[PDB]
Amino acid sequence: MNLQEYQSKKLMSDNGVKVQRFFVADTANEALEAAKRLNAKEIVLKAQILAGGRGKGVFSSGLKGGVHLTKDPEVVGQLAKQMIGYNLATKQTPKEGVKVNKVMVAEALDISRETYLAILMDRSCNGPVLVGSPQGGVDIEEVAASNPELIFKEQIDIIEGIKDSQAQRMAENLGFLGPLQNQAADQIKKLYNLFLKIDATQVEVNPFGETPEGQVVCFDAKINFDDNAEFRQKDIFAMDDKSENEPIENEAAKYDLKYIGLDGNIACFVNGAGLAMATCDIIFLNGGKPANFLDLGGGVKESQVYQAFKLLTADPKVEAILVNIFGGIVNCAIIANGITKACRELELKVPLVVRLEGTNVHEAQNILTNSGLPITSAVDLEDAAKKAVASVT
Amino acid sequence: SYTASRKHLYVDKNTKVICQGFTGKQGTFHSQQALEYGTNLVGGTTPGKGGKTHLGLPVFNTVKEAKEQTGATASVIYVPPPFAAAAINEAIDAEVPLVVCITEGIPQQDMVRVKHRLLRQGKTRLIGPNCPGVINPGECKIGIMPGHIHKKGRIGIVSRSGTLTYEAVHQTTQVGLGQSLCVGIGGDPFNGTDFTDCLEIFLNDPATEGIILIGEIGGNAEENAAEFLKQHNSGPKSKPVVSFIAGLTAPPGHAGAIIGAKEKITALQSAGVVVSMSPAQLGTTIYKEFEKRKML
Ligand SMILES: Nc1nc2c(ncn2[C@@H]2O[C@H](COP(=O)(O)OP(=O)(O)CP(=O)(O)O)[C@@H](O)[C@H]2O)c(=O)[nH]1
Ligand SMILES: [Mg+2]
Numbered sequence: 001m002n003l004q005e006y007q008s009k010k011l012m013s014d015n016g017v018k019v020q021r022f023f024v025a026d027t028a029n030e031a032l033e034a035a036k037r038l039n040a041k042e043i044v045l046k047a048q049i050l051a052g053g054r055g056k057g058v059f060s061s062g063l064k065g066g067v068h069l070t071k072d073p074e075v076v077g078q079l080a081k082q083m084i085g086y087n088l089a090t091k092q093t094p095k096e097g098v099k100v101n102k103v104m105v106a107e108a109l110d111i112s113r114e115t116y117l118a119i120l121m122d123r124s125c126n127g128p129v130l131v132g133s134p135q136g137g138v139d140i141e142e143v144a145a146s147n148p149e150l151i152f153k154e155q156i157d158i159i160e161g162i163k164d165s166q167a168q169r170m171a172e173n174l175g176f177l178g179p180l181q182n183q184a185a186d187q188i189k190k191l192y193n194l195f196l197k198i199d200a201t202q203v204e205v206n207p208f209g210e211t212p213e214g215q216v217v218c219f220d221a222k223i224n225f226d227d228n229a230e231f232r233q234k235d236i237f238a239m240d241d242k243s244e245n246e247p248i249e250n251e252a253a254k255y256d257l258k259y260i261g262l263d264g265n266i267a268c269f270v271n272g273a274g275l276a277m278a279t280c281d282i283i284f285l286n287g288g289k290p291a292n293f294l295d296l297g298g299g300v301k302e303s304q305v306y307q308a309f310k311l312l313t314a315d316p317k318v319e320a321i322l323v324n325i326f327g328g329i330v331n332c333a334i335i336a337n338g339i340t341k342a343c344r345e346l347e348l349k350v351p352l353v354v355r356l357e358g359t360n361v362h363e364a365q366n367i368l369t370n371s372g373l374p375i376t377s378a379v380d381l382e383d384a385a386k387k388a389v390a391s392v393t
Numbered sequence: 394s395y396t397a398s399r400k401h402l403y404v405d406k407n408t409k410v411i412c413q414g415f416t417g418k419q420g421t422f423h424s425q426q427a428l429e430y431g432t433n434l435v436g437g438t439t440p441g442k443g444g445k446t447h448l449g450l451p452v453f454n455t456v457k458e459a460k461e462q463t464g465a466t467a468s469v470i471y472v473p474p475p476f477a478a479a480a481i482n483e484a485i486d487a488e489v490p491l492v493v494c495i496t497e498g499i500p501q502q503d504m505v506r507v508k509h510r511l512l513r514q515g516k517t518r519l520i521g522p523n524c525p526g527v528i529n530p531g532e533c534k535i536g537i538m539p540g541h542i543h544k545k546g547r548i549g550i551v552s553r554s555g556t557l558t559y560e561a562v563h564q565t566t567q568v569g570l571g572q573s574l575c576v577g578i579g580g581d582p583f584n585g586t587d588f589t590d591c592l593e594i595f596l597n598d599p600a601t602e603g604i605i606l607i608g609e610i611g612g613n614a615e616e617n618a619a620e621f622l623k624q625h626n627s628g629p630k631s632k633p634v635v636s637f638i639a640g641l642t643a644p645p646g647h648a649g650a651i652i653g654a655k656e657k658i659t660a661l662q663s664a665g666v667v668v669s670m671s672p673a674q675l676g677t678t679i680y681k682e683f684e685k686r687k688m689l
Contacts, residue, residue: 052646118648123582123612126512127505131648144651151651158506199502204646222646229500231475262644274554274580274609277640278672284642285671298497298537298555327525327539327559329422357563358539359426381560382673 001225002050006104007239008223015194017187018217022106024048028084032077034105042071044108047083047100049093050244052222055138057090059083060097066090069108076105101243109217114207115174116140117188119156119195120224121202128195130154130166130188134175137207162192174208176216184208184216191218198236199229252311255304257294259311264289265319266388267312267350269305271296271328279324282381288389291318300330302338309342313350322388323354324381332356332364340371348374351391355384395511398518399590401491403574403598404467406532408491411459412437413480414471416447419495423471423537424448430540432533435463456480457487467491469526469535477522478503485510485517492585493535494521504583511585519585525555525577536577538562546571548679549595551588552607553578553614557639557672561605564676570683573601588618596625596632602688603633603679606666608657610640615657622664633682634666637675 006024013019021038025031035043047054047066054066063082070076080103087097114137122129135143135150144151152173154166167185176184195203202224209219230237242250252259258273262280266288270276276293283290292315294308312318325335339354355378356364368375378384410427414420415437425448427434436451436459443454453459456468468489472480477496484492499522511519520527526536530543542563548570552558558577565572576591578584588606595601608615615638622634638657658668669678683689 116647118646118651120648121501121505121582122652124652127509127583129652131651140647141650144647153652158502158509196502199500201501202646202648204648206647224646226501228474228498229502232500270556272554272556274552274557274607274639275560277609277643278554278557278560278637280643281639281641282672327537327542327556329419329537357542357559359541380563380673382671385673 001227001237001240003223003225003239004048004050004102004241005046005221006048008221011198011223011236012194012218012221015197016190017194018215019221020106020109020217020219022104024102024104025080026084026102028077028081031080031103031105032073035073035076038105038107040107042069042108043073043076044069044106045076045079045083046104046106047088048102048104049088049098049100051090051093051098053090053092054088057088057093059086059088061086098244109211109219111207111209111219112212113175113210115210116206117174117191117208118202118204119192125153125155127158128156128192130156130170130192132170132174132208134173140206156192162189176210180210180214180216187216187218198223199226199233200224201226248311248315252294255307256297256299257304257308257311258297259292259294261292262290264291265317265392267291267318267321268293269296269308269312269321269323270294271298271300271325275324275326279322279381279385282385283388286385286389288385288392291315296325298329300328300335302334305335305338306342306345309346309348313346313348318350320351320353320388320391322384323352324384325355326357328358332358332361333367336364336367340367340373343373343375353378353384353387353391355379355381395515397515398490399593401518402520402527402576402586402591402594404491404527404529404533404535406433408467408533409433409435409463409465410467410469410533410535411435411456411463411465412469412471413456413484415439415452416442417471419471421448426540427534430534431531432535435465456483456489460487460489465489467493467535470494470496472496474498474500478507481507481519482510485514488516490517492517492519493524493526494519495524495526495537497523499523499581501581501583504581508583508585520576521579521581521584523581524579524584525558527574527576529574530572538575538577542566543575544571545573547573547600547602548605549573549598549601549603550575550605550607551578551591551595553580553588554607554609554639555580558607560672561607561637561675564673565605565679568676568680570603570676570680573598582612588614589621592618592621601632603635603683605675605679606634606636608636608638610638610643610654616660619660619664619666622666627665631665633679633686635669635675635679635682636661636666637669637672639672641670
């Protein structure tokens with residue numbers, strides 16, 4: 001899970017990390033009301049998108065930058081009108097872009113030096129690792145590829161925690177000299193402690209800046225949170241806007257159903273992300289375009305099989321539903337009655353191709369074939385795919 | 394080293410299994426399936442229910458208690474995520490040779506700490522978490538995989554995907570090859586067993602003549618598996634390796650990039666792996682590879 005910048009920034013300040021004073025506005029004229037509310041020597045305008053690369057990204061209006069800097073609150077309302085509502089297409093967004101619904105007006109600070117710092121769990125590094133570079137700001141991946149020697153790594157022992165010798169060494173490799181070395185090392189420690197506290201998979205600060213007054217500040221923050229830790233990060237996961245996701249995605253999540261929309265007409269209902277992708281893969285192989293796949297997860301409950309049909313059919317783009325359940329924890333005959341019951345109780349139009357191979361399949365297929373419902377059973381994955389592309393004629 | 398515990402991945406009919414989370418909803422169902430399939434399930438554990446009887450088997454409060462009473466050598470975990478990591482630790486403390494954690498949803502931080510200790514010992518071998526388990530067809534089934542689709546055979550299957558593994562299994566049985574050993578390593582980033590761990594066992598198992606590797610987009614696990622096969626599998630006793638990478642048609646911070654299906658397929662092929670582009674042709678591809686090499 002990912003939060004906006006104005007949400008991560010708050011978490012950082014509450015844990016001793018130095019960040020910029022900020023305000024968020026939903027309109028362009030309100031961004032002017034907030035720019036004046038700062039009482040700032042300068043004001044920074046930052047489009048709020050969960051993707052990175054705002055600096056050199058262009059909007060659908062002509063504005064060449066998701067980030068702008070001005071000294072007069074009157075210019076923010078003009079630039080804010082060129083941000084809110086538009087898609088911001090950057091290096092890491094879809095070519096169509098992402099609609100910008102919020103913008104950040106913050107007490108802008110001067111940046112004497114830009115560095116890159118990141119804390120994340122990395123499989124190869126076997127646990128947390130500090131990743132930093134003195135060549136921070138804007139493109140970090142460019143310098144990471146050109147000059148690998150400018151990337152410094154410090155593997156942190158999850159048990160011992162971050163030691164002083166490690167924070168000092170990283171701070172020195174990032175170029176923090178004089179009294180700023182111990183100040184940066186202290187921010188690195190508080191960042192790592194925050195990284196562990198919020199069950200983050202990645203805390204990325206770019207630029208890990210250095211003001212002329214000698215204050216180490218995190219100017220931009222991108223915190224990625226472990227979805228598995230939501231049960232112990234309730235306050236944080238409540239902050240998830242959910243607005244940047246399709247409404248059906250949020251609706252499927254209500255019933256413990258993960259939805260991934262696609263540009264096709266054959267909806268897919270599968271148990272297992274790996275199988276769902278394989279189902280989509282084999283549909284292309286036979287000329288079809290899957291409209292989406294609704295991953296069911298191991299936990300099957302006859303209530304969500306009823307719902308699953310509801311969400312897929314809610315989208316008019318769905319011209320067919322492919323059910324592929326293989327090796328579930330619940331008996332197939334139980335899923336067979338939930339499918340029929342759902343069909344009977346919902347008046348299904350789109351053709352329905354069902355493949356069941358879990359436990360007690362012989363009875364399940366009989367429940368479907370002898371139901372008098374528009375249900376054609378499938379034997380294997382290839383059969384269901386070929387039968388799904390055929391039903392879209 | 395922890396690699397010394399690789400051997401414990403190859404369960405057999407003599408493996409005596411206990412179920413952590415025995416009386417739980419999941420543990421009951423899959424424990425019944427394990428007994429009906431012929432697995433030597435000799436009890437389980439649930440805190441506060443030691444002494445009671447469950448599925449005709451004894452219930453214990455702790456894993457070590459169950460181990461000294463039943464001589465168990467393998468353990469399967471269905472404990473919920475908040476306490477599944479501690480359940481793995483309880484088995485490592487008891488020095489259970491093989492631990493299989495089925496539970497999905499364990500915080501990554503918990504598994505980072507678990508794997509930290511796991512790598513510093515060599516007595517316990519962990520499979521998972523968030524995995525379907527391991528099965529020696531006909532001899533031992535530790536996990537959630539449907540048993541009826543398996544049949545003891547000649548193809549060692551390793552899969553990073555869940556239910557997708559069953560497709561490779563069902564196909565290898567229909568083509569008459571069957572499976573020697575099937576291992577699901579799970580879909581979590583921090584786990585006790587990776588591709589190379591299983592490939593090592595396959596390449597040294599006489600019963601395993603062919604290998605199927607099921608993968609998907611994300612990370613570099615498939616890339617690492619390729620490098621492993623390039624050096625150790627290229628030779629006179631090279632065993633045919635087939636693979637399918639899910640998400641070929643799937644659509645697409647900076648720290649992860651600092652330290653992609655197409656790259657995986659090309660990497661596996663460079664090591665000699667025959668990559669089936671269709672998820673339904675894993676059995677036919679390996680079958681014809683056996684035919685090319687006069688292995689049938
Ligand atoms: N003077 C000043 N400049 C700023 C301030 N905030 C951002 N900038 C400048 O604008 C740039 C915008 O970068 P930023 O939005 O943080 O990141 P990005 O362009 O999306 C690239 P990445 O995703 O890797 O962070 C900064 O690199 C810096 O040069 C500020 O408060 N004051
Ligand atoms: Mg940034």
